[PDB]
Design a protein around this ligand. Structure first.
Ligand code: NAI
Ligand code: NAI
Ligand code: NA
Ligand code: NA
Lengths: 294, 294
């Protein structure tokens, strides 16, 4: 089991840490244009590793060669943004970097599953699958999981208990929605209040903490776990749809089955209103992609 | 089980994360002069928590009240430094903050074990024990563990295998040394090379990565684990000595026994040369304390 990480920033490195803490990993690789940053992350992860009596190979640098062998690669590389500076501006910039990465991931680690995390995730996930020759089952994105984690919290807060299932699907962003039809938990809650908090929690945290890290790392871990350990679990995942729910040619968050073969749309029936909400999100995402020449 | 954290900076927050990932914790508290920073860390840890189906109480702020109840408190609060700016300058500054914290920890969470991490750890550990009424068994410092983790790595690198024990003791800093007399592992290694790498690894990482985080978090976790779970383990810990090895009135790193009662000098015989190296470190630390009016 080798894990690959393109981007050794806050989320890349904490993701890798989390995985190291809970998975039987033999090798971890960290690629990043910031060469020294990637090496130092590697060094620090190794020191961490030695304290739980794990001793895997942890290499860090800037050559995509390091990725050779990876069963899966978490791509967090790019830029987050703010200081006024535009949404679409980063979309272009990152889209440039994502296209560029896919090419490198393919001429180095051809057979690796690719987990896209870089924002706007649904959009970058699509661009990744498009720019690499790969089948829609070897490229997907982390987002909804994290959204759902937030959901599961606001619920336990609002009284809910024995939360067996609770997901958020659709766009990882504004047009997201709770899949009420699948909620399973004891205790009455206010779906109004809850649906609301979640969407704006993302930035409520960013303005205070500076960025979102620990939430994202765990979500990423849960996905990687499901693949490296062939658990067969079902996790809201951003996936290229080719017909499902009347949607096509776009990535969007839908319940998926993760396992050694990557991801596959878990066929699960949704509310009639739930399909529209999904179709809306696809439209919005489809707009944003055409904006980019895809 | 409540964990308290004074300082929600890089190490405080990643420590708390690590603990959340591996301990059955009911409440986590994060105090920091940066109020919003502490809240955001709390929020993010909670989102993280929900993804491993843990749902503890995580509160964050600036009032030391949040600490009430803590079985143990990890203190990472202060400043790290560089841009030229002097060693001793921070020692004074942090010593001011540490004295100030001890008072608050005592009039809020009287019965809590206190884990000192803020650098120069051995020095702050002593100042903490002095400024709080507390017995030398309820205040100690994390350092040698982390040093040892690094050690265990450079060894596995140099061939060593089945490393059953391998510690670094003495000052957490320049006058540290390997306790060769207790090393236990298959394979010949070069004690020259190894002893050397370790001391300067700390900053080799800092210049690249920016700071040391994941190493420190795990070390801190291993200590907290041993206490909250009464494991009785023996871990190089920075401790106030009152006679042991011919040393007194100073904190320094010696093999210790951690358990529900905190820490106690594990009585372990050391090489004759090993005692001198320890006594030297005590002298250096004793100098640095008198420099501070202690
Ligand atoms: N999908 C999700 O749920 C979440 C996504 N994210 C996103 O992931 C991205 C990373 O966030 P952070 O970790 O905070 O970023 P950082 O913490 O800013 O990480 C970015 C790293 O990417 C590297 N990089 C930039 N260009 C590169 C290139 N051409 N090739 C290789 N490496 C390159 C940088 O050197 C940097 O270290 C952001 O877009 C952020 O919004 C963040 C949280 C959650
Ligand atoms: N003993 C060890 O092995 C290690 C010790 N450290 C040390 O721990 C300290 C923390 O490192 P970082 O996490 O990187 O620092 P940060 O990442 O700079 O964390 C410091 C936090 O302390 C807070 N703070 C400052 N003054 C305070 C006060 N009077 N009351 C409450 N909070 C206050 C700050 O707001 C800040 O968030 C440093 O001194 C560093 O050298 C770091 C690594 C290892
Ligand atoms: Na599968
Ligand atoms: Na004990």
């Amino acid at each position: 089991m080798k894990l690959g990480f393109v981007g050794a920033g806050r989320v890349g490195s904490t993701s890798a840490f989390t995985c190291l803490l809970n998975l039987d990993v033999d090798e971890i690789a960290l690629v990043d244009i910031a060469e020294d940053l990637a090496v130092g992350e590697a060094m620090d992860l190794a020191h961490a590793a030695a304290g739980i009596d794990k001793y895997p190979k942890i290499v860090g640098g800037a050559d995509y060669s390091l990725l050779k062998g990876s069963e899966i690669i978490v791509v967090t590389a790019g830029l987050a943004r703010k200081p006024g500076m535009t949404r679409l501006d980063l979309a272009h910039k990152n889209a440039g970097i994502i296209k560029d990465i896919a090419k490198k991931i393919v001429e180095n680690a051809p057979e690796s599953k690719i987990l896209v995390v870089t924002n706007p995730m649904d959009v970058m996930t699509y661009i990744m699958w498009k720019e690499s020759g790969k089948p829609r089952n070897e490229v997907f994105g982390m987002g909804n999981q994290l959204d759902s984690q937030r959901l599961k919290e606001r619920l336990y807060n609002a009284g809910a208990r024995n939360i067996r299932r609770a997901w958020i699907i659709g766009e990882h962003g504004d047009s997201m929605f709770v899949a009420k039809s699948l909620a399973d938990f004891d205790g009455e809650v206010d779906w109004e209040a809850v649906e609301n908090d979640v969407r704006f929690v993302a930035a409520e945290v960013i303005k205070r903490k500076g960025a979102t890290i620990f939430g994202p790392a765990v979500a990423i871990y849960r996905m990687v776990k499901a693949v490296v350990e062939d658990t067969g679990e079902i996790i809201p995942t951003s996936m290229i749809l080719q017909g499902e729910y009347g949607i096509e040619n776009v990535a969007v968050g839908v319940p998926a089955k993760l396992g050694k073969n990557g991801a596959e749309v878990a066929d699960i029936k949704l509310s009639d209103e739930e399909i529209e909400k999904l179709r809306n999100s696809a439209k919005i995402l489809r707009e944003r992609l055409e904006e980019l020449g895809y």
